[PDB]
Amino acid sequence: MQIFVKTLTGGGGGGGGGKTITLEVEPSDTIENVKAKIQDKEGIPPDQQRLIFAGKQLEDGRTLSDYNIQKESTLHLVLRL
How were these coordinates obtained? X-ray
Contacts (Cβ under 8 Å, ≥6 apart) of 73: 3, 4, 53, 64
Contacts (Cβ under 8 Å, ≥6 apart) of 41: 21, 23
Three-state SS for 4-31 is: EEEECCCCCCCCCCCCEEEEECCCCCEH
For CA atoms 68, 26, 18, 58, give the dihedral sign: positive
| Residues across the chain | 81
Q: For residues 6 and 38, what is the distance between their CA atoms, to the nearest angstrom?
A: 11
Q: What are residue 49's phi and psi, to 5 degrees?
A: -110, 140
Residue (of 27, 4, 8) closest to 78 by Cα position: 8
Domain at 1-81, CATH from 3.40.50.720, 3.10.20.90, 3.40.50.620, 3.30.110.60:
3.10.20.90
Domain residue spans of the chain: 1-81
